Design an enzyme around this catalytic site. Sequence first.
Site, PDB file in Angstrom:
ATOM      1  N   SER A  81      -3.856  -8.863   3.299  1.00 19.61           N
ATOM      2  CA  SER A  81      -2.872  -9.364   2.387  1.00 19.61           C
ATOM      3  C   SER A  81      -3.565 -10.376   1.543  1.00 19.61           C
ATOM      4  O   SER A  81      -4.241 -11.266   2.058  1.00 19.61           O
ATOM      5  CB  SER A  81      -1.700 -10.073   3.091  1.00 19.61           C
ATOM      6  OG  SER A  81      -0.658 -10.336   2.163  1.00 19.61           O
ATOM      7  N   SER A  82      -3.438 -10.255   0.211  1.00 21.59           N
ATOM      8  CA  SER A  82      -4.224 -11.132  -0.570  1.00 21.59           C
ATOM      9  C   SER A  82      -3.613 -12.474  -0.477  1.00 21.59           C
ATOM     10  O   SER A  82      -2.405 -12.681  -0.596  1.00 21.59           O
ATOM     11  CB  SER A  82      -4.393 -10.729  -2.045  1.00 21.59           C
ATOM     12  OG  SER A  82      -5.407  -9.738  -2.137  1.00 21.59           O
ATOM     13  N   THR A 132      -2.171   0.529  -7.302  1.00 15.69           N
ATOM     14  CA  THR A 132      -3.471   0.397  -7.895  1.00 15.69           C
ATOM     15  C   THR A 132      -3.610   1.349  -9.046  1.00 15.69           C
ATOM     16  O   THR A 132      -4.113   0.973 -10.102  1.00 15.69           O
ATOM     17  CB  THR A 132      -4.598   0.683  -6.946  1.00 15.69           C
ATOM     18  OG1 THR A 132      -4.693   2.077  -6.689  1.00 15.69           O
ATOM     19  CG2 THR A 132      -4.347  -0.088  -5.638  1.00 15.69           C
ATOM     20  N   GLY A 143       6.501 -10.112  -1.885  1.00 14.59           N
ATOM     21  CA  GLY A 143       7.933 -10.118  -1.930  1.00 14.59           C
ATOM     22  C   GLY A 143       8.483 -10.964  -0.825  1.00 14.59           C
ATOM     23  O   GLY A 143       7.773 -11.377   0.093  1.00 14.59           O
ATOM     24  N   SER A 145       0.856  -1.146   0.000  1.00 13.29           N
ATOM     25  CA  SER A 145       0.000   0.000   0.000  1.00 13.29           C
ATOM     26  C   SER A 145       0.890   1.191   0.000  1.00 13.29           C
ATOM     27  O   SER A 145       1.987   1.159   0.555  1.00 13.29           O
ATOM     28  CB  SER A 145      -0.918   0.117   1.227  1.00 13.29           C
ATOM     29  OG  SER A 145      -0.290   0.903   2.227  1.00 13.29           O
ATOM     30  N   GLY A 146       0.446   2.275  -0.656  1.00 17.03           N
ATOM     31  CA  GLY A 146       1.265   3.444  -0.696  1.00 17.03           C
ATOM     32  C   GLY A 146       2.328   3.227  -1.723  1.00 17.03           C
ATOM     33  O   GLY A 146       3.295   3.981  -1.797  1.00 17.03           O
ATOM     34  N   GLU A 175      10.215 -12.661   2.240  1.00 13.14           N
ATOM     35  CA  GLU A 175       9.866 -12.305   3.580  1.00 13.14           C
ATOM     36  C   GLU A 175      10.780 -13.023   4.511  1.00 13.14           C
ATOM     37  O   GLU A 175      11.281 -14.106   4.211  1.00 13.14           O
ATOM     38  CB  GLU A 175       8.432 -12.706   3.947  1.00 13.14           C
ATOM     39  CG  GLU A 175       7.560 -12.965   2.717  1.00 13.14           C
ATOM     40  CD  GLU A 175       7.354 -14.464   2.597  1.00 13.14           C
ATOM     41  OE1 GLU A 175       8.365 -15.195   2.411  1.00 13.14           O
ATOM     42  OE2 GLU A 175       6.176 -14.894   2.705  1.00 13.14           O
ATOM     43  N   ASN A 189      -0.082  -8.960   8.330  1.00 16.24           N
ATOM     44  CA  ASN A 189      -0.543  -8.053   7.313  1.00 16.24           C
ATOM     45  C   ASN A 189      -2.031  -8.035   7.357  1.00 16.24           C
ATOM     46  O   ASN A 189      -2.683  -9.056   7.151  1.00 16.24           O
ATOM     47  CB  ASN A 189      -0.090  -8.488   5.900  1.00 16.24           C
ATOM     48  CG  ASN A 189      -0.452  -7.459   4.823  1.00 16.24           C
ATOM     49  OD1 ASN A 189      -0.103  -7.635   3.656  1.00 16.24           O
ATOM     50  ND2 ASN A 189      -1.159  -6.361   5.204  1.00 16.24           N
TER      51      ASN A 189
END
Lengths: 146, 153, 375, 375, 845
Positions: free
Chosen positions: E243-244, E186, E466, E181-182, E468, E240
């Site tokens: 988180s998808s 999107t 990404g 996010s950020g 982790e 998260n």
Amino acid sequence: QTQIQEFKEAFTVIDQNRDGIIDKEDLRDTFAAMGRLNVKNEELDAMMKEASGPINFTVFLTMFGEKLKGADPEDVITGAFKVLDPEGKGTIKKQFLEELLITQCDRFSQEEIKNMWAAFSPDVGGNVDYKNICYVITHGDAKDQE
Amino acid sequence: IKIEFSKEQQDEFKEAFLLYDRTGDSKITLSQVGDVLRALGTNPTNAEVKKVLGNPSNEEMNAKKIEFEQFLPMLQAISNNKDQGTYEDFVEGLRVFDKEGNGTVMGAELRHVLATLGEKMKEEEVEALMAGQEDSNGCINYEAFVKHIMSID
Amino acid sequence: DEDETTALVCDNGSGLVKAGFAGDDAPRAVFPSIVGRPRHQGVMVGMGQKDSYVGDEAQSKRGILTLKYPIEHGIITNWDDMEKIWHHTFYNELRVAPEEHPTLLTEAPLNPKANREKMTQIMFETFNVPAMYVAIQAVLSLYASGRTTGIVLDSGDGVTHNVPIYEGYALPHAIMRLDLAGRDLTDYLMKILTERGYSFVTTAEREIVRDIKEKLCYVALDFENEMATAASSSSLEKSYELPDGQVITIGNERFRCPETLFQPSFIGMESAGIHETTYNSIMKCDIDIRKDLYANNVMSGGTTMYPGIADRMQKEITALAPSTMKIKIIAPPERKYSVWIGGSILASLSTFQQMWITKQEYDEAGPSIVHRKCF
Amino acid sequence: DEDETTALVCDNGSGLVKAGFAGDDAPRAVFPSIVGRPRHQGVMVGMGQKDSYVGDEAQSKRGILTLKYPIEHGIITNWDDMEKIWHHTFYNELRVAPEEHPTLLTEAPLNPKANREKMTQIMFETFNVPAMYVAIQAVLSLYASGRTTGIVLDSGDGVTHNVPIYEGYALPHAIMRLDLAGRDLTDYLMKILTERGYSFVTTAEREIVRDIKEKLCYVALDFENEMATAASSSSLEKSYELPDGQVITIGNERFRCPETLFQPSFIGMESAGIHETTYNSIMKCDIDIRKDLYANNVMSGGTTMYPGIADRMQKEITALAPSTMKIKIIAPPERKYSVWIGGSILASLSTFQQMWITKQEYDEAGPSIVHRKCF
Amino acid sequence: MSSDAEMAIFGEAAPYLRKPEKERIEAQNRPFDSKKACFAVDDKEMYVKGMIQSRENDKVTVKTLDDRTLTLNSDQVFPMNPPKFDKIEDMAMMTHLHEPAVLYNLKERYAAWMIYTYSGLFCVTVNPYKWLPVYNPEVVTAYRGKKRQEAPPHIFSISDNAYQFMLTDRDNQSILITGESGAGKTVNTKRVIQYFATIAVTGDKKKEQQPGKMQGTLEDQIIQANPLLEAFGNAKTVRNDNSSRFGKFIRIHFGATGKLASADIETYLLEKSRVTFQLSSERSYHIFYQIMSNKKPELIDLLLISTNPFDFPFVSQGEVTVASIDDSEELLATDNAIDILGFSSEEKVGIYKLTGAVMHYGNMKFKQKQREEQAEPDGTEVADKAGYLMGLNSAEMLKGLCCPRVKVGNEYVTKGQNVQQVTNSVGALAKAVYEKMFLWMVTRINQQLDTKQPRQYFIGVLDIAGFEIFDFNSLEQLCINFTNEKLQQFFNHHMFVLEQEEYKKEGIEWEFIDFGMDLAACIELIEKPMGIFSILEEECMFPKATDTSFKNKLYDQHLGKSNNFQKPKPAKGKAEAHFSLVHYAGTVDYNIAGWLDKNKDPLNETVVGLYQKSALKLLSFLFSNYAGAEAGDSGGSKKGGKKKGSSFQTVSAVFRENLNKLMTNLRSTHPHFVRCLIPNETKTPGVMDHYLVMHQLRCNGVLEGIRICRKGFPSRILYADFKQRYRILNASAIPEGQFIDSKNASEKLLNSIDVDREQYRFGHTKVFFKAGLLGLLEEMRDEKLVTLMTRTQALCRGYLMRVEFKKMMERRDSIFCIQYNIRAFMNVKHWPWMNLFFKIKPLLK
Ligand SMILES: Nc1ncnc2c1ncn2[C@@H]1O[C@H](COP(=O)(O)OP(=O)(O)O)[C@@H](O)[C@H]1O
Ligand SMILES: Nc1ncnc2c1ncn2[C@@H]1O[C@H](COP(=O)(O)OP(=O)(O)O)[C@@H](O)[C@H]1O
């Protein structure tokens, strides 16, 4: 031939001695017309001794020889000064001039500068006027000024 | 190795300078003394090379002419003096229009405020004894000229 | 981060290592001292066994495995095997990092200097203990007890000593040896049970008799009478369940076995049985002190755990010793771990802490440092 | 294209081959092990039959054929016949070109080393498998079961064994053998039925009676009681149709035939019944383990498929064994294919994959390489 | 005009891209000497630039831009990049890679309002928190129909050039996108989608046109779907919040020649394991919680449930709820979501109920308290309800569960079932239904998504999270690391090819191997036979084996055997982990809780058999895939897994399956990689959190990135280029002119420099530079630059003095006369004769 032939004259007026030598009486007798006194012994003769025998004008020249040694014309001197004075006839600034002699190259002494001042070295406006100093010394002086 | 002529030529330039200082030879003028005749090397060279601790002034020491003699040659002998062609490239970096104009002030301030400076009058005077004009000034020209030394012919 | 650390007290027993941290009341870790691998080693479909853990596993493991005891008779004969055991205690049981703690190991009576020396090098070089001490097992026991005067009878696994102490001093000359202890008894018991028509040769079968010795065995009020009673005795016959499922009955054997301590002739020991040696020891000491010795003598060790031990011992001793003389027999409640405790204290002796042996000392002097002019 | 291949697991049964692809839950292929030609060989008009395929074909073909089992008693006596069979397995039944697949073969207990080798040479040279393994049938079955521990009663076609296993280890010494099993029992039913006045001599008939053995028979709660009951027995008189269409009655016979396992004396084998052989097997092991073995008795093989076998197994052991002992009989539901499944585990065992013998190994060392240090 | 800048500096489209000429110019000559100025490691900040006082031995004495003196370590000091470098687009260009160098550049640009940087292939863009004019349509005009080199980094570029590429190259293309996010992740998707829109119409080529039926455009076609699917998927992991769960390849394809034919969706990655279980501050997929809430209550009743997530074990395992959520509202939304995508509520009832069915299967107990071994159902409450919803027979179903019967040439009874087993089927059941539903749904979108327009070649897009590292790593992590690795290796290989091509082309000698390969040993350890994975799987088989047994196996095989395999030491407390690995990656430590147990996938044949009957949806799903057909045992496969001997297949096998599939595609198409970042926790422009990015970089692998670059000869220039700048360093008389032939002179400079040959090579066209030579070079010019300056100043000085001189000399003679003549005077005035002569003269007439 100027100067010496010029001298030649000066020598002869006084002369009239025989033959052309200007010897002691000539000198003293010149003074009378001159018309200032004249130490009539001694002093006058001492004047002789710088020289080795009677003179005769030629030796008169030769005796002089120191006089020739330094001295450039007249002209050329002005000349040297002129280089000094960015401005007009105005002429050389006092404070510059003292500084240029005294601390500069061949140094004038404290006194040495002073003598010149004392003689005064005609000056006015808090400045200096060279031409009248040359009028006295180099020109020989033939006045100055009343 | 110099050689009568030569060092002797160096001597009488030297002679006068002594004559100015009163009559004896500072030490200090040194750089100037035989800057006058030709080697560029600059303050830090001067200072260490012999004036006094770079010779802010008197009266730390005195040279003298003869000692000064060998200085002039060795303190010379390099060569990397500097050079009109090389300068230009330097000048050019500023030039930025490659026009061989600058930008007159920029310009004086560069050499001023840069590297060692470089006083204002000195800069101002040189450029227009050098006589190249303001819009804009070939810094390359100015350098090329000034390098060449002031006379030329 | 005040300053001061633990001490790893490892006690190398002939049959059991006991180890833990100093300042604890009892050893946290107690495990069999053995080495063992599949004797038959079938193969199978795979693996995931450990070659010679012994450790805890073996005992459950009975029937598959073999035993070795590097420290069989109290002195460590096998270094390589030895190294692994120490590994086991540190890593497996204690789950400690040897690096962090000073470690106190104890050694057997008449352990050679060389033996200490091998031990020492292993500690420093192999294990990376910061610090190391080697403690005299009997001495530790002495420490644990707390008694200055008196005389002690220590019979553990495999040696039994009588040891006079006067003012903290074990009079060396006084001290007595008997090889007999309770490994022998274990061995003896196997024999006796067999005569009935039972068989216990094997290793598994070894453990079993030991269980039977420790649960059942007792020492008689009077040996001679006890045999006499047995015929009409009806208590004597108690029964024991074998792991096989079959059940043995243990009539006379129960007392027969321990009788040996009193009478070594049973096994074939010439040795004077325990009471006599005691007496022999005291008379060996000066006459005057003996009064104190008699008053304070003092049971230790696993093989002194039999109920009835004390009461008899005085009966025997009094018989030997003179009329007016006063006799006391003392036994500590948890005698067997007396060795560990004693170590536990002196490892845990902060005041004494200077005693501990250092890596630097090891480097400078050598391991020998621990041996010479200290422990 | 990542890598890795199947394994051809064909279990060479004395009567049935089962063959499959590794990773198969159960065999794709099961067909008889017989060799047989038209006995009469009438001639006819034309041909187009396959002389001694015996195949599946024989079964539907009953009456016509002769039979032979190269692998009659579990060991491949006849290589020529054997080659016939394997060819059938690969090409005909499986349809799989052998050269592609590393093949795992099972082999009988006590297969001679030479026997093992002759097998190898044929696989490499005859079939041109890139690779292959030989494995042991009993061993295979244990694998399928996944019991580390316990004693197994694996009664198959014609052999019966009790294998106590401890930590994956068949204990060789424990093992008892039994000649008796299905092949024998099959005969017994035959002979007894003939007692009634029925006549079942022939091959065709034998197949028939086998069918009756596998449908109808059971094992009794108690032999003696059941027999006595037999008189009043409403139940036994179950009927069986013959392909000829005649219907025969059985039912005394149903239990008697199986009773043979328990009392092998029926047929004339002196041998101990499985229940007692089990007991003997356990006794052969060490006492400590036995408890586990009682706990885990697992049944194996086709001849252990009779219902209520376990309950009976339960009672008999209980009878023999000690009071306290816990006894558990566990039986896998599709026990017969325990041998194949068996190979399936091993065969498609990719960690273990090296274990497969390879051509080079065959070349360098010879077939014996399979034998000598691996399977 | 001059400056590295085009068009119009000022114009607003420029500023993210351009830098203004003035800003650049100020930027390039800020002070700089490499020697002192550097970077030092700072405990807090990350690194800090600072300068060096002093040196001796290992310890160096230093002063920082917090100007205290620390004495750091010799290695520990970091040499900075030369001034030439600053304000640099592509970090790779930087001669000194160092992290504080890394901070400096991007940090510097970003405050500048420069978001974008180019790193090699990569196009990094930072998040300006503030609004930036960049987006403007005027800027667009600037972009479109241009080559990417032509302008600084922007989407419209990537969208366009690829569009062109697809036509010319006539291939599918791909872009990947990362961004948390950020990111602004999107928007770019919006931006790109439209981009497709822009060209997809454009053409130059004709592709089958129709007036049209419609149903919403692509882009919206996708968007409508999103909310629901992410309702059900999506969730909050302990980390998260949103988180998808899943990984989306969203496929927009085009025709040969760049018509758009239409779109389709494929999904992969469902960790069903959530479904039963949740750990800690975490919970399941959103929906479970949602259903239970009171948006829905008609639905809850169809479920026959009392709304309360607590009440049932299937749900109850973790926590009931999370902040920041509202299950009910999300319920209302999702029901709305379901509508918008526009099915047909019966299916909805439908899709609900059967997920619901899952729950009921959740109810039933297992016992008949294991008579003796077997487990049989308890209650047949659920089984009938179960039976009903499906419409299948409960006598049957119960039986089917109780004892499945299966097939072979003969059919066997799968005895199979146990007390322990069974539940690991109910959950699996639940997971299956859900996933089959998901899958069936997807295809429907495709039917809808099916547009008119034909397609050959598509571009686009991969989304999954990404690399982790956790306090507690586990099966989830290791896989991700696994996936990253091969990926990274994929990347390494690709460029390895290209460079050597280039090297070959120029004809400078190449000795290297594929860059990927160095890693390979690591991944192999995971992947290959007797790998950690493989070994784990077969360990799965032994009924007997335990964590330890697995433990020893890895130990035996790997421990110490590979440098890769290492282990965490006990510390205080702190942590416990079995072992650690060193992936390309940096190292990682993992721990066990779960995995074999977590592993167990068993298929239950008969259930599938039983299931085949009755309710229509159920038959379909269970029977097979959508309309289509399959094959059998002829001609397959690789030891693909198929059964695994019995008990169906595990996860690891399938993982092999998927990845291989993923790889097959990727290498098919030409990659591009975009990485989006968020600068620092508190969201401000300019700003750079040294630690955060650094961590980012290694995870990014971007640093790795940089490492490969070390491998070869980074800096490359033309000789002609080389000569022009550098010569000022070493001059000769001959004019730059093009008088000096480029070849000769550059030969001359280099050798007269006496660089060793090793450093560089010629070169018909180019000279190949190594690390550092340029760094030497730049530095020296720096020092050179100064000196001549002073020398010019030297020159100016001479100018002054020389000019003084003549004035000086002139004075000398004037002075000389002055001194002597007056001196002449000093005597004369006294000497009598002189005086007299002067008087005498005027006497004369
Ligand atoms: N309750 C007990 N009764 C009799 N013998 C015991 C008892 N407990 C332990 N033992 C025995 O004591 C011996 C161990 O005693 P210990 O003092 O530890 O010996 P050591 O120090 O010589 O290794 C073993 O033979 C053991 O069987
Ligand atoms: N349900 C059954 N009941 C009784 N006997 C059976 C049953 N199924 C198979 N058998 C018998 O088991 C034997 C085959 O068992 P198996 O374990 O395969 O033997 P082997 O491995 O020795 O070839 C045959 O005699 C067969 O008739």
